Amino acid sequence: QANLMRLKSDLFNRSPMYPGPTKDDPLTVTLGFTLQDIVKVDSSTNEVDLVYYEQQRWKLNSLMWDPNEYGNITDFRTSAADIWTPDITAYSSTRPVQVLSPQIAVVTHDGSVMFIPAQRLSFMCDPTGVDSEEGVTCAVKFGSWVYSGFEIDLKTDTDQVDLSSYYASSKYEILSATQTRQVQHYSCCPEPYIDVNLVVKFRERR
Amino acid sequence: QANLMRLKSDLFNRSPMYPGPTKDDPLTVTLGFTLQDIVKVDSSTNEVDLVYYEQQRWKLNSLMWDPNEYGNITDFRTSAADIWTPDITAYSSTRPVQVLSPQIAVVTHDGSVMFIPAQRLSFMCDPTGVDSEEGVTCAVKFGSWVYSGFEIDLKTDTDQVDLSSYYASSKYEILSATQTRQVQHYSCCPEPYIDVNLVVKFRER
Amino acid sequence: QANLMRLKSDLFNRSPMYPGPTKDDPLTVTLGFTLQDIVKVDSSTNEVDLVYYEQQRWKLNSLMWDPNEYGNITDFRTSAADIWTPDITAYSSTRPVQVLSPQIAVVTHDGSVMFIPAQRLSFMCDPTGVDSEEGVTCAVKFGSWVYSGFEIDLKTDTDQVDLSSYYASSKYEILSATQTRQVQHYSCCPEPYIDVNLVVKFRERR
Amino acid sequence: QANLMRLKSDLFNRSPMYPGPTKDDPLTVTLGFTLQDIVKVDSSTNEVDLVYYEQQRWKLNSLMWDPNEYGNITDFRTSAADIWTPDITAYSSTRPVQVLSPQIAVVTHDGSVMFIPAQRLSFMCDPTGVDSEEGVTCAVKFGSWVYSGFEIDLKTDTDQVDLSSYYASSKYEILSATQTRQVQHYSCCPEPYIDVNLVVKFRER
Amino acid sequence: QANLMRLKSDLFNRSPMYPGPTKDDPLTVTLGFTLQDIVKVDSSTNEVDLVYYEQQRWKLNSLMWDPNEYGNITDFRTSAADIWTPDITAYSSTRPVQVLSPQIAVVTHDGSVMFIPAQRLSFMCDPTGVDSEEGVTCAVKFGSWVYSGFEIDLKTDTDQVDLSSYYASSKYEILSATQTRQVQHYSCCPEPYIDVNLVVKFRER
Ligand SMILES: *[C@@H]1O[C@H](CO)[C@@H](O[C@@H]2O[C@H](CO)[C@@H](O)[C@H](O)[C@H]2NC(C)=O)[C@H](O)[C@H]1NC(C)=O
Ligand SMILES: *[C@@H]1O[C@H](CO)[C@@H](O[C@@H]2O[C@H](CO)[C@@H](O)[C@H](O)[C@H]2NC(C)=O)[C@H](O)[C@H]1NC(C)=O
Ligand SMILES: O=C1C[C@@H]2OCC=C3CN4CC[C@]56c7ccccc7N1[C@H]5[C@H]2[C@H]3C[C@H]46
Ligand SMILES: O=C1C[C@@H]2OCC=C3CN4CC[C@]56c7ccccc7N1[C@H]5[C@H]2[C@H]3C[C@H]46
Ligand SMILES: O=C1C[C@@H]2OCC=C3CN4CC[C@]56c7ccccc7N1[C@H]5[C@H]2[C@H]3C[C@H]46
Ligand SMILES: O=C1C[C@@H]2OCC=C3CN4CC[C@]56c7ccccc7N1[C@H]5[C@H]2[C@H]3C[C@H]46
Ligand SMILES: O=C1C[C@@H]2OCC=C3CN4CC[C@]56c7ccccc7N1[C@H]5[C@H]2[C@H]3C[C@H]46
Ligand SMILES: *[C@@H]1O[C@H](CO)[C@@H](O)[C@H](O)[C@H]1NC(C)=O
């Protein structure tokens, strides 16, 4: 209690919040998806709804401490409002993303942060052929809304979407689900933009 | 008024809020459900909606006081924003949980806290067989979102879900409802996670 | 303007907010309902939606003042956030209550407060038989969420729900509407809890 | 920039917000509606949905300044949170009113304020006869929620609702739309209440 | 980190926020739309839903800095709450606009700001004829809610709406989409108001 209180006071009250990365001091953010459910499909609007956990990890020098100086504390939990978080956004959502979990992050003594919001997302997807044996493929890109590849580098720990928590009695079964880093250039602008392309192949079950 | 004002000032203004548990100083949180209604079932999306009260109890040394020092006050009510509260979350919700009651907790002189949010929850459930006599069983786990079993231990006072306030004219009748502590390990994570599994067997009326 | 500004400053900035009642210093809260409309019925979910005004009144010594000391002001209006308000809640709602009026209360020099939120409420009600001549009866209890009868006493000024503002062209006509104080005990806990039971008998029009 | 910053600092940081009117110092608020669209009708619930702009004007001595003292500034725009605003409310809404415009007001050197929220409103209305040539008439009163006629006087600049921005391809055409000051007493209350009654006659194509 | 922290502290903590433009010091805001999808059409209410990115650009002297003084930083990203933003609003929305992107802007050393909110908008549109080969045309104006043309000038970089990100498998195909500056006068008021008129011609695929 007392040690943790002192640590949080030192990290958060005695210094300003991290202002985000720059060209000079870029930040790597790792993303991974855990797909829980394809909740619904809307063939009249071509919108599909997913529920997933989006794991985000990054590391800041300003969040480092020595466990010996603070009662051997190697990590703690704190409100996501206490710290900077990356602006990772679905590019083709049709509704505001709905948050299903509390906004709390885990901070480790090496300055690494793990933040894993559960979300429900409606996104642009033609579900025609979902009732067939081949099923249907849909895709949605996630990236920083305003940081280029010079400020934020996105990576994945794996190209496989974690399906170990997928709901066994969903209306839809997953045939494949991948998460792939893409570099993108746009005609206006010189700098590269990074996204992770979440590609899901699915169909109605049996 | 004056005594209570002084107590709240001492507990909340004159010291920092409890920062949450650690490996060294873990916290036990007791959970209990009162199921009020199965409001609806959606066979096109496999989502079911429940209304329930979720009682949460825990105890902190930092919330202790001597009643004699504060006008014989043995307990008080306060906004949940004034205190730390646990991050207990349904694992398989499909919509943000909707809160139906005001966010107020009861604090007792021994440092124990009782907080009982009424909630409406949409969660993943295949309702196939709800129209049958056998009915259907659905389950949803509740636990801390980011604290492991090393920091937060969950328990129940009983394995029976309180059904005494269940809505008599619901579209669905309850055949059974249980609440059971589970210890879980994951491929992701080395540390154990504790949840309470709410299992409800029901059918159409 | 100047006198009222000074009064509000004295009551709200120069002292802490009332911390709520206790066993030693209980508070009586008077409730009355004005039923405006039965807006809808849902026979697939057994939910009914009402629109009403819920008048709440109570009195605090801490909100007293002498009109002579403050430019002859006998009352004022203020945001409900400036003052303590009771945690009166429907026991059997199925959705969060929707507030239709601004959150403003009237405070009188004797310390009495009048707060009258207009609300739309979805609550548990089987509407089977609403299309019949006998109609249907539904009920919903309102009480403090966490204060017992030792801290908050609820009363009504009358057992009749005010129907003078009921919408003349509603889909549903009201046969009766009553509001009755009840004392209740629950198996766990020694202390009594007070509620007001709103009972409404209605049917389809004409 | 610099002059305006100084003016806002003098008006808002150097003095308290206006606390609202009293019996001794009543306030006149002028209302006017611009009806944009009758968006929908629900004959199963007797709810109708309108989109309109509600112009509100009032004048306070505390918001006066001399333009010469502040770089010739005769008016400025500011967040509605910086100032007091009246609690004008539809009496027969069935859903919380939805705000479609940013909450910003215009303040003029004579202390006059203009605030014009665009809103979508669902209100109690039987639409039976909307498909006929005569159409249907519906009405909704707007007034202060908690100030009586002793504290706030409402007026209109005109009895005609502005229809110049009405959506030409709406599902519903407007036959007439009026806005009329009414004085009212209630069984509850000794003091008179002022409202503006918005009466709209409309029909399908 | 350290240089950027100092820059933000200098710009945002050590001086007041920009209070908005005046007649004396007007501001030009450039708008451009990127239409992503016509998501739905409602022929029972004459409402259509679009998803788009609205790029907004303006320039303030108060946001200028010398890169040499701050570690060669030529630009940074910051929360839109840290800075003033224009009150650009759709004139004919039927629901509050839904924001799909985080509220973050890019600020450049010359004081220029780029802010690009992704939005879902329901607006007044008769979709009769959408199933035909000619299709249907709908329009919606965007402008400042309370600043006139004397305080805020709107312009476009181009009259063509960017369709390069339009969703290939939308139910609706775009025949044309234009964005055009308009000057407007209103009977009440002496001052001109500027808007950008977004005109979209589309049909079923
Ligand atoms: C924090 O942890 C370190 C070890 O992980 C502790 O340091 C050791 O304490 C043991 C047991 O008393 C000694 O025998 C070792 O010599 C110490 N050093 C090392 C490097 O192992 C330390 O005492 C812990 N601190 C607290 C307050 O619990
Ligand atoms: C409060 O009320 C008293 C009277 O009840 C006001 O004082 C009187 O003011 C009138 C003019 O309005 C004078 O002619 C009287 O001589 C005053 N009498 C006394 C005893 O003071 C007083 O002005 C009121 N306060 C206000 C309006 O702020
Ligand atoms: O030109 C583009 C299109 C592209 O759209 C998909 C979403 C993206 C997320 N943000 C939103 C704005 C954007 C951007 C920034 C700077 C120049 C061009 C540009 N955009 C989008 C772009 C990506 C990346 C970035
Ligand atoms: O990927 C998972 C699966 C599992 O999901 C059920 C809920 C859990 C409670 N919290 C939420 C995040 C989670 C966790 C932490 C770190 C990596 C992966 C991960 N999760 C969930 C997990 C448990 C434990 C933990
Ligand atoms: O045990 C209960 C059930 C009962 O539910 C109906 C509604 C009530 C209003 N509040 C909500 C919490 C509650 C309460 C307080 C303390 C211990 C148990 C307890 N609850 C509910 C109770 C009443 C009274 C009170
Ligand atoms: O009983 C009523 C009905 C009537 O409703 C129309 C609107 C009004 C404006 N405010 C809102 C609350 C109200 C009022 C005050 C005290 C007791 C009952 C009561 N109401 C409304 C009333 C008027 C006047 C007042
Ligand atoms: O008289 C009007 C109608 C017109 O409506 C289209 C939208 C507009 C954008 N803002 C919103 C308020 C408004 C305006 C300013 C001052 C008095 C009246 C008034 N309005 C609207 C007007 C334009 C311009 C401006
Ligand atoms: C900034 O640019 C100058 C000029 O090239 C260079 O000398 C300096 O090292 C750069 N970096 C910093 C942090 O000032």
Author numbering:
A (entry chain C), C (entry chain A): 20 to 225
B (entry chain B), D (entry chain E), E (entry chain D): 20 to 224
Passage from the reporting paper:
Protein-engineering methods have been exploited to produce a surrogate system for the extracellular neurotransmitter-binding site of a heteromeric human ligand-gated ion channel, the glycine receptor. Acetylcholine-binding protein is a highly conserved ortholog of the pLGIC extracellular ligand-binding domain (ECD) with properties similar to nAChR. Mutations affecting key residues in the orthosteric agonist site at the α1(−)/β(+) interface affect the potency of both activation by glycine and inhibition by strychnine. We therefore set out to generate a high-fidelity surrogate of this α1(−)/β(+) orthosteric binding site using the 2α1:3β stoich­iometry [Fig. 1(a)] by exploiting protein-engineering methods and the thermal stability of acetylcholine-binding protein from Aplysia californica (AcAChBP). Ultimately, the highly stable AcAChBP framework has allowed us to introduce nine amino-acid substitutions that have resulted in a stable surrogate for a heteromeric neurotransmitter site that binds glycine.
